[PDB]
Amino acid sequence: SKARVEALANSRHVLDFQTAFDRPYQFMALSEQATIEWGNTGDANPHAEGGFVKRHGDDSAFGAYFGRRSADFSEAVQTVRDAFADLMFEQNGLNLFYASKMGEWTWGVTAKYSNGKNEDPTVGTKATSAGVAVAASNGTWDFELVQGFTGKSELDNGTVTAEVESKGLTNVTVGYHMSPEMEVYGNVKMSKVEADLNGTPIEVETTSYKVGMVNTLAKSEEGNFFYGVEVASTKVKDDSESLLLPVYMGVEHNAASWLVLRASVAQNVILNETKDDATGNKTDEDSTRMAAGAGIKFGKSVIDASFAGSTTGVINANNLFSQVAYTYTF
Template sequence: MVTAAAPMAMASKARVSALAGSRQLVDFQTAFDRPYQFMALGTQATIEWGAGDEKYLVGSGATPADGSFTTANPHAEGGFLMKHDDYAYGVYLGRRSSAFNDAVEAAGVKNMMREQNPINVFYASKMGEWTWGATVKYSNGKDEVAGGTILAGGADIVTAEASSLGFAVGASNGTFDVELVQGLTGKSTFDKDEVESKGMTQVGFGYHINENMEAYAQYGMVKADITDGTTDSTYEKTGYAVGFVNTVAKTEDANFFYGVAYASEKIEDERESSVLPVWMGIEANATSWMVLRGSVKQNILLNETKITAANDKKVNVDSIAFNAGVGFKLGKGMLDANFGTANQGHLSFTDGAGADKFLSNVAYTYNF
């Protein structure tokens, strides 16, 4: 696993994104979907900040493709993990569900709320040869003047509300991994507009061929009913992936890995794609106090997206993706940051937007 080169750098989006989110990574961020991984981490506190995150949709009925989101304010998050010999537990604040928010964004409704005030509580332990874990997530938010016109006497106040509840469970015996992420409820309303979850499920299975190689399969689905005034519609997204990852070289100072997968995704009445991504990455100690990370990823042979919303037009463009980051060891702490990756890897202090900006995702982790 890619941890030996930087044993303290296991708690940041910056690290995961710099290493292409490869399956074999063990990190605080990957453990939310595979909670048995919390047993592989040590007692620590971590804080994330940086890239902008949206609270509301803006504009009149615009869609995300129209650039209708505001990213003026960063969305911070953070929490702690307490580790003992046979169990671990902790609390994490601010981690939003991409599945729920995708459904909200698909509605394209002005001032509709995404997840607000999310909190994760998690626990992991050992049971014989198996390590298992579970996490429960809850969020709730309300704004009684969101986009509303307040008339004399306080009449005509429009309320925006959003709430969600879900959990994740998983187990591993070192050879087999199984995990399930399940959304139980999810609802966002604004006046007469509403998005309500009808199903959010993600399942995964991993088989460790040996210490360095793993084959895996994943499936996910999101379904929600959307009411936009008097019009009803359904948002439905499904996808699956089958892949293989291999840590080719692993020493005390560096790890080099590669992976390949077949992935398919479909958003009903919008687009569908089939791709064959190949990626490689490295994490290495540049000095005793600094860790450098980088990865490159590209679709080969299969790289087609069919835009069903545009008369089945097909897109097959350059898919190269470069990511890089750095970690600074500060005593028992680690400061992680990623580099901007806009324009096919051209690093700049000004290029990109949101997570593509230079040093946009930053995290500080302290290991007790």
């Protein structure tokens, strides 16, 4: 579930449905599951989503997913939106994926398609998205690749013209497992997007690098206390430049026969500076953050959620569970 992955701070060691859309070899290592994320139909948060994964024999896995929305697309559309507020997100997200085991190497591929339009004279919107993700794994080595083919969103209504177009989206990840407890990974991500607000052309170009590590402090059953160090440098051309060292630690515990408790804390240690270009001014604010969540188990049914009141520290009837998901494991 999304809440499960968030409560563990995107630990990069977590095996989940939501973490396999970019690592499709994990669809072979997962179990047969059906998953639904609670939410609404329009452009609301959270959005309704759902899918399934099944095994074709004993060496293949196939499945589909409804309503997934990209982050690189929704973020750019949101950026252009408040700068015209009728530009469109991914309309009918369609994800197909497949994975097989060729000997000792498992490999997988996921495909994403989306299309929607509105031809009313007062609402001139249309949106199209497409991309693929290919990954192969060995158990000791790990390789992933994410490619975006097309991305577009136009609004031509009543003398107002707006567009956002994806000019490329690359995402390469390499992982190495020195042991079944410790692993090291690296990542390079380029993203060039160009938009027209009303004859005004704007172009952004994002470059990211990532080197990390995930280990285990407490080696136990019931739960494992995990910890991770990471170095991240993000360069946005002619806008800003960042360099962070996020350190996180957390645990996932089978508290009861009906409860799973997830918690983590993170903070950028020593390195938290985001220098702003064309000015030279830096920014080093507080960055300590936490996430908490619960998973209620009824045999083959699990309701993952996050504690709604963790941010204020308060948990009561009015703030109990938010970001709910349901999973059925055949």
